[PDB]
Structure 1
Amino acid sequence: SIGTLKRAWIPLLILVVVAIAGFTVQRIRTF
């Protein structure tokens, strides 16, 4: 339903941003 995906867009956007940032930083740390 739209209710849970438009009331919770800020938290999910923050979670995805943190997810990609963490993935890329973990990938960089091994260089």
Structure 2
Amino acid sequence: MIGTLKRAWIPLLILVVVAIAGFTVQRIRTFFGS
């Protein structure tokens, strides 16, 4: 429902950014050594 999702859009965007960045970081953390 849009009325309540567009009220917490900042925490949702922060969560999306944190998730994407964390997955990309844990992916890059495996390139060294191998």
Between 2-11 and 15-24, report the one with greater CA deviation.
2-11
Q: Alpha-carbon deviation of 1:3?
A: 1.6
Q: Tell me, which stretches of 5 or more residues in structure 2 are unaligned?
A: none
Show the counterpart of 1:7: 7
TM-score by length of 2: 0.78
Determine which structure has more spread, i.e. the larger CA radius of gyration: 2
Q: Tell me, which stretches of 5 or more residues in structure 1 are unaligned?
A: none
Secondary structure at the counterpart of residue 21 of structure 2: helix
Could you list the per-position Cα deviations for residues 1-31 of structure 1 after superposition, in whole angstroms to 9, with x for gaps in the alignment?
A: x12210010000000000000000000001x
Query: How many pairs are equivalent?
Result: 29
Show the counterpart of 2:27: 27
| Identity in percent | 100
